Amino acid sequence: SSYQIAVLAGDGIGPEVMAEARKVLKAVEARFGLNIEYTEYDVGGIAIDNHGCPLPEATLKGCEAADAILFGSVGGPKWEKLPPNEQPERGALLPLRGHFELFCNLRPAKLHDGLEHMSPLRSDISARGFDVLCVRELTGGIYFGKPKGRQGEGESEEAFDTMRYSRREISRIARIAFEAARGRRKKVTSVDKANVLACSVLWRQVVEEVAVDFPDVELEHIYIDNATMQLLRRPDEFDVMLCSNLFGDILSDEIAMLTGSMGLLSSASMNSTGFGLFEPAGGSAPDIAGKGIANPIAQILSAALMLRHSLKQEEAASAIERAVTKALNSGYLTGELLSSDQRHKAKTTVQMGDFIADAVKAGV
Amino acid sequence: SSYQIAVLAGDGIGPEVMAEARKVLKAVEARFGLNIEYTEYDVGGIAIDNHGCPLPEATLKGCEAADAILFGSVGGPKWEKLPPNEQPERGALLPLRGHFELFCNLRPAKLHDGLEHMSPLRSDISARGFDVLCVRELTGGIYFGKPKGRQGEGESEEAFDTMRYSRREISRIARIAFEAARGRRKKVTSVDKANVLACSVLWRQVVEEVAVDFPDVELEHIYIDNATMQLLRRPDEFDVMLCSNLFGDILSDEIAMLTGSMGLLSSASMNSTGFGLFEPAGGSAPDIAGKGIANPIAQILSAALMLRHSLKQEEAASAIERAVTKALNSGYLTGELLSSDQRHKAKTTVQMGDFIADAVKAGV
Ligand SMILES: CC(C)[C@H](C(=O)O)[C@@H](O)C(=O)O
Ligand SMILES: CC(C)[C@H](C(=O)O)[C@@H](O)C(=O)O
Ligand SMILES: [Ca+2]
Ligand SMILES: [Ca+2]
Ligand SMILES: [Cl-]
Ligand SMILES: [Cl-]
């Protein structure tokens, strides 16, 4: 009836950009007639400080009661001193994905008109633009495969991780990729290492089995090392890229960096009911936190992805997207999007949130 | 006494660039007084055509009798139609590495003075230059780990690959990295995914144990997804990067692409006796083969790495390196290194080989 959203702002700039996303959602709630209730829970570094662990039981139970999780960012210097297997990022994210079976990660990345110059690519490559959606399988492969651990002592002590995938796991994430490519430029590029990995031989086989249901979509396969190179030369020739868990982690981040604009990038991680966790692509930026400098666009577009995919409110989702476009093309830019001779034109976190919420209210 | 080299030219441009490397080696043999004998063996696509498999027994036995393998390139359209697990590249390279225990791969990559413009990076990043040596562990981890295979049928059919590393395996490749960083800029960046993988937790632990023998070398650790991004922003801040097998495959290729000059790049894969296989970093380029267009520099620098690391002939190795530098700075460039208004200034494969061999003879 009423929608229930668990709000997990986390660490660093999380809370200050989350405030702007809630301001924009308030404008959307009024314009479209939606009744949404929000509960806040601690997660990450702040949860370690307040509760002794990065994902408290009360937080986990709170997400169980919600229709979606609007997530900020976790991690920072303070806890970067604990062993990597106890740090807040992995400690919050891996159990949330496992617990809610969030097998599908979508990370849309594009070069926005007029910001091509921020990409680290040579200017004649970035002038061509790109628009790539990465679909990454998030609950299988080597992240959760067993056995995992270590045995032995001294020189012969060894550690082991198992990459495992079943046909059922590959076909469900491949179907999402093909369905997405239909709505875009009808091309899926599947990324694997089938010259070495048994998992990748199965991957490429099952992706070709799925392809028969999508005769209008072009399928190509590429090895992961070749993909990491080709994205530097012709990123405009990719449309949907479909990846297993580890290869998707690497490639989605490489493509995010090639935009030069990580403050604009959001991520959705969903299960088959469309419950999901929506978060900015970038990190907690603890050096700028509490200064009003942080770009809230990524957190605001996370809330748009959440309205579309979890709450099936397409019109509300696109109203936010258009309000963001209006900001970007009316010169409302934060400091990290400006060449530093432009730096004095930078808008603060709050001016961005006010502008975008006002544009939604105004009927954009 | 006499050195014995197995020559495995392979497919595509392999034979035409190998001819130039042998022409340059002939000049080195005369200038330094070295007696080297060469035997040629088929490998790759040509071996499939002549012998029915990509690594014939006679070839394998021939490499056993040699002091090093000078290797060209394998693979091409003709065989790209066989299953990926039967194609010539994996079919020649994985058993050669396993058989001879070639655990250490070195791939030096640098932006050469005056060719910065060919990099796909933005011009203000490539102007700063970079010079990164990738040390990749080549016989452990997920490439050769067991169990590997598949079980089950239908939707529940699954495939599995095991990533495994022992302390002994990590410490031997880490020692090479630290020893190399001493001779360069005294920094090792180790690349892992210790927030997820048991193998990476062990990796980072053992690398820190090795570090105690090298108090003058700075060590930092970085996650693989972060490394793939940071190489796009500050590649000048890395010196030696130390990687496990799969992460090294991805990162060494990303760095090769960032030079924009893969025709200049070579690779050494060695065991603890210093037997090795030396090859160009790039592929068989079957579209330009037999035209005299291909850049033989990578194959000539492979022969220099082979003289240095396998034959311990440092002076002969550096004479080749300097002859290459002389070519690059005397305008002897092949077509792929020229902006296509310059295209008519391109030298052919043979003019390059003649120039470099003549420079070695002249006492460069
Ligand atoms: C924190 C880490 C486990 C995580 C991952 O590897 O999935 C992060 O890199 C990401 O991409 O969301
Ligand atoms: C052909 C393939 C097995 C090989 C690898 O993955 O090592 C190649 O990509 C390389 O980098 O030499
Ligand atoms: Ca990542
Ligand atoms: Ca490779
Ligand atoms: Cl995986
Ligand atoms: Cl590995």
Numbering used by the authors:
A (entry chain A), B (entry chain A): 1 to 364
The authors write:
2 Å resolution crystal structures of the SoIPMDH–IPM complex were determined at room temperature at pressures of 0.1, 160, 340, 410, 580 and 650 MPa. In the structures at 0.1–650 MPa, with the exception of flexible loops on the surface of SoIPMDH and residues that adopt indistinct multiple conformations, no characteristic structural changes were observed. The volume of this cavity shows an initial decrease in volume, with values of 55.6 and 50.4 Å3 at pressures of 0.1 and 160 MPa, respectively, followed by a constant volume increase with values of 54.2, 57.6, 64.7 and 65.5 Å3 at 340, 410, 580 and 650 MPa, respectively. No electron density could be observed in the cavity at 0.1 MPa, while at 580 MPa two peaks were clearly visible. In the case of SoIPMDH, the volume of the cavity at the dimer interface is only 56 Å3 at 0.1 MPa and reduces slightly to 50 Å3 at 160 MPa. In the structures at pressures ranging from 0.1 to 410 MPa, the solvent-excluded surface at the bottom of the groove is nonpolar since it is mostly composed of the Pro108 and Leu305 side chains.
In this study, structures of 3-isopropylmalate dehydrogenase (IPMDH) from Shewanella oneidensis MR-1 were determined at about 2 Å resolution under pressures ranging from 0.1 to 650 MPa using a diamond anvil cell (DAC). IPMDH catalyzes the reduction of 3-isopropylmalate (IPM) to 2-­isopropyl-3-oxosuccinate in the presence of divalent metal cations such as magnesium or manganese ion and nicotin­amide adenine dinucleotide. In this study, the SoIPMDH dimer was crystallized in complex with its substrate, the IPM molecule. As a consequence, the SoIPMDH dimer adopts a closed conformation through binding IPM.
